[PDB]
C-alpha cells in the first residue's frame, strides 16, 4: 500500500497538522512506522515526511511526529538540488541547513544525531554554518559536535562558513577552537576562501587567530588570491601581521593592481595606476635592498612592451588605457606564472572588449594566446572554440577577411581538444559522463563550424594544405557522436545544431564545401550510425531540395564520386532511395545510381537468406552484409 503514505508525505510537505493527525489516526505500531519512515519521491527529491517537514520548517509537524509516534532520527534520503544530491541525510541536517532553529531544537531534544555523517562525510554543523544561523551552530556544538569532522575533500565547517559573509558564525567557530591551518583538497585553508570572497572581518579574525599563512597545493598564498579576487580592502591588512617580509606583500600589491586593471566588475584605470605606482615606489624606495622584477620576454601577442623599469616609462603609459590593460595582463601572468586557472578569464574578457569596437585582429590574437594558455594548462576549452567560431562567423558576415594562420591555429587547437575529449570520455565515470559526451559533441560541432569558416574564406595553397592536414588528422582520429554520427554524417545532416549567436548566419548545415573538404581529406564515406544510416541516408532526407538545390546536388555528387553505395541498407533494410522523403533527392540519386549486377545478386542473396559464410571472398561477405 502506498496511497496513505503518499498522502502523509504530502501533508508533511505542506505542513497540514490536522491532515497528518487524521491520516495517522487509528494506526498500529507497524502502520505508524510505515507511514513515518517511508521515503517518498516528489519533484526530483527522494525524502521522508520528517525530512521534508524539517526542510520546510514545520516545527509543529516534527514535534507531533516525534513526541507521540517516537519516530527514529536515523532516516535517509535525497535532499536539496543545484549540485546537492547528498544522500543519507537525516531530518536534523535539513533543519540545520534550512535555518529553522525550532526544528533543530525539537529534533535534538528528541534524539537527533548531531554528529550524523552523510554520504560525503557531512555533519549538520556544516549545513548550519552554511545557512548562517548562530543559534543552530551553538546548540549543535553544545551537543558534542566535532568541528574537525570534514568532508572527503577535508573542508571543515570553518572554511565553508568563511566562504559566505557571516561574521557571527565564523567568530563563534574561531572562539570554538576551530583549525585555522586546515588543509583542503588542493592544500587550501580557510583564509584562502575568506580572502577570495572579499570578507575583511573574517580575514582579520583569522589572522587574529594566527591563521599560519601558507600557499595552497597549487602554490598560491591566500594574499595572492586576495589580490586576484579584486579586493583591495582584504589585501591592505596583512602588512601589520609582520610575516609578509617584503617580497610577498609587494607581489600582492602588484597582482592586486593587475587584477584591477582587467576584470568584468572591477574595471578601472585610476586606482589601478595608483596601486601600481605605490607598488613600484615600495620596490624602488630604499635602494640598498631594491627589488628587481624578473622581466618576462615580450610575447608578440602582448604587443611590444618590455615592462616598465623606469618611473618615466610608467608615467608615459599612464594616459593610455590599452597599454595599461596590456601591461596589467603581462604582470598578472608573470606573478601567476601563466599556468594558473585564473589567467584565462582576464585575457578572454579583454579579447571580448577588443571585439567590442570591431578590432577583430587584436581579439583573435588575444584569444589565441588564451587558447594556448588553456591548452598548456590541460583545461577544457570547448566554449573558447565556440567563441572563435562565433567571431569568425561575425567577421565573415561583415565582409572582413579571415587570417588563414589564425584559423589554422584554431583548427589545430580544435583537433587537439577533440582528441582530449575522446581520451577523457574513454575512461569517464558515470557521474559526469553526460556532460563529458556533451562537451565531446560541442567540440565536434565547433570543429565543423571552423571548417565551414575556412571554406568560406580564401587562402593561399600552403595555408589550405595546413588546414586540410588538420582536417585529415581529425578524420584519421575517426570521431563519433553519441548516436554514431561521424564527421561526414554531421556535415550532411540539416539537424546538426549550429550555434545561434553568430555561426547561424554563416555556418549552414548541410554544407557542400565542408563535405567536399572532408572527402578530399580522406573521410570514410560508408560509415554508419547506430541506426545504420550512412551519409547518403542522411542527405536524402533533406527538407529543402528546391530552395537549396545546389548544396544537396553537390553533396550527392561528392558522396557518389568519393565512393558510396546508393542501395546499401541500414538496420531497417532501407535503401537511400527508400529513406529519400523528397522526390528531388530520389531522382538525383537515381541519376547518380549505376546499375550493377553485384548489387542485384547481393540483394537476392540477402532476400533469399542463403548462407554466404566462407562461400564468398571476405570483401563480398561484408558487401552482402550491408546490402
Amino acid at each position: 500500500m502506498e496511497g496513505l503514505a503518499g498522502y502523509v508525505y504530502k501533508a508533511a510537505s505542506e505542513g497540514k497538522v490536522l491532515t497528518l493527525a487524521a491520516l495517522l489516526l487509528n494506526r498500529s505500531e507497524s502502520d505508524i512506522r510505515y507511514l513515518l519512515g517511508y521515503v517518498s519521491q516528489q519533484g526530483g527529491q527522494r525524502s521522508t515526511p520528517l525530512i521534508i517537514a524539517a526542510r520546510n520548517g514545520h516545527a509543529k509537524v516534527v514535534r507531533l511526529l516525534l513526541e507521540h509516534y517516537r519516530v527514529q532520527t536515523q532516516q535517509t534520503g535525497t535532499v536539496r538540488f543545484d549540485g546537492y544530491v547528498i544522500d543519507g541525510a537525516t531530518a536534523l541536517w535539513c533543519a540545520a541547513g534550512a535555518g529553522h532553529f525550532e526544528v533543530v531544537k525539537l529534533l535534538v531534544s528528541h534524539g537527533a544525531n548531531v554528529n550524523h555523517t552523510t554520504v560525503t562525510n557531512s555533519t549538520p554543523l556544516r549545513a548550519a554554518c552554511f545557512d548562517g544561523r548562530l543559534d543552530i551552530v551553538k546548540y549543535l556544538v553544545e551537543n558534542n559536535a566535532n568541528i574537525s569532522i570534514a568532508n572527503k575533500y577535508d573542508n571543515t565547517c570553518l572554511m565553508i562558513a568563511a566562504y559566505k559573509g557571516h561574521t557571527d558564525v565564523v567568530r563563534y567557530l574561531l572562539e570554538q577552537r576551530a583549525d585555522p591551518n586546515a588543509k583542503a583538497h588542493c592544500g587550501a585553508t580557510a583564509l584562502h576562501f575568506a580572502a577570495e570572497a572579499g570578507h575583511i572581518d573574517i580575514v582579520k579574525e583569522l589572522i587574529k587567530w594566527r591563521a599560519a599563512i601558507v600557499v595552497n597545493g597549487h602554490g598560491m598564498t591566500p594574499l595572492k588570491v586576495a589580490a586576484e579576487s579584486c579586493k583591495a580592502d582584504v589585501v591592505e591588512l596583512l602588512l601589520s601581521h609582520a610575516d609578509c617580509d617584503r617580497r610577498s606583500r609587494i607581489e600582492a600589491l602588484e597582482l592586486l593592481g593587475a587584477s584591477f586593471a582587467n576584470d568584468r566588475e572591477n574595471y578601472d584605470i585610476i586606482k589601478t595606476y595608483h596601486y601600481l605606482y605605490l607598488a613600484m615606489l615600495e620596490r624602488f624606495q630604499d635602494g640598498d635592498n631594491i627589488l628587481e622584477k624578473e622581466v618576462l620576454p615580450p610575447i608578440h601577442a602582448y604587443g611590444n612592451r618590455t615592462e616598465c623599469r623606469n618611473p618615466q616609462e610608467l608615467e608615459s603609459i599612464r594616459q593610455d588605457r590599452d597599454a595599461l590593460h596590456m601591461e596589467g595582463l603581462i604582470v598578472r601572468e608573470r606573478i601567476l606564472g601563466a599556468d594558473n586557472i585564473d589567467v584565462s578569464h582576464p585575457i578572454i574578457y579583454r579579447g571580448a572588449v577588443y571585439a567590442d569596437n570591431m578590432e577583430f585582429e587584436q581579439c583573435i590574437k588575444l584569444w589565441l594566446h588564451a587558447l594556448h594558455l588553456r591548452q598548456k594548462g590541460n583545461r577544457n576549452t570547448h566554449k573558447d572554440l565556440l567563441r572563435f567560431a562565433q567571431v569568425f562567423s561575425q567577421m565573415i558576415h561583415l565582409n572582413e577577411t579571415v587570417k588563414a594562420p589564425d584559423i589554422e591555429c584554431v583548427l589545430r587547437c580544435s583537433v587537439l581538444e577533440i582528441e582530449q575529449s575522446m581520451n577523457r570520455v574513454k575512461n569517464i565515470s558515470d557521474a559526469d559522463v553526460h556532460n563529458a559526451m556533451d562537451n565531446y559533441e560541442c567540440n565536434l560541432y565547433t570543429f565543423l563550424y571552423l571548417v565551414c569558416i575556412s571554406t568560406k574564406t580564401q587562402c593561399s595553397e600552403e595555408d589550405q594544405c595546413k588546414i586540410n592536414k588538420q582536417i585529415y588528422n581529425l578524420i584519421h582520429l575517426d570521431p563519433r557522436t553519441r548516436e554514431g554520427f561521424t564527421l561526414l554524417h554531421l556535415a550532411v545532416n540539416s539537424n546538426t545544431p549550429v550555434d545561434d549567436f553568430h555561426t547561424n548566419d554563416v555556418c549552414s548545415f548541410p554544407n557542400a564545401l565542408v563535405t567536399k573538404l572532408l572527402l578530399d581529406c580522406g573521410a570514410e564515406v560508408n560509415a554508419v550510425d547506430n541506426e545504420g544510416n550512412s551519409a547518403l541516408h542522411i542527405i536524402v532526407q533533406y527538407n529543402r531540395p528546391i530552395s537549396d538545390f545546389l548544396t544537396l546536388h553537390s553533396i550527392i555528387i561528392s558522396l557518389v564520386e568519393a565512393g558510396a553505395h546508393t542501395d546499401m541498407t541500414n538496420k531497417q533494410n532501407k535503401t537511400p532511395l527508400d529513406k529519400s522523403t523528397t522526390g528531388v533527392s530520389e531522382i538525383l540519386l537515381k541519376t547518380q545510381m549505376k546499375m550493377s549486377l553485384k548489387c542485384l545478386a547481393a540483394r537476392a542473396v540477402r532476400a533469399n537468406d542463403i548462407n554466404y559464410q566462407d562461400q564468398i571472398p571476405r570483401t563480398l561477405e561484408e558487401f552482402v552484409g550491408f546490402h
Binding site: 549540485g83 572588449v353 571585439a355
Partner: peptide, 23 residues
C-alpha cells in the same frame, strides 16, 4: 546581444567547487 555580456565567470570552476563547498 554581444560577446562581452555573454561571457560568464568561473561557473565551471564554481561547479567544480560545488563538490567541495557542499553543506
Amino acid at each position: 546581444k554581444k560577446h562581452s555580456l555573454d561571457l560568464l565567470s568561473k561557473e565551471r570552476e564554481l561547479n567544480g567547487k560545488l563538490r567541495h563547498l557542499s553543506p
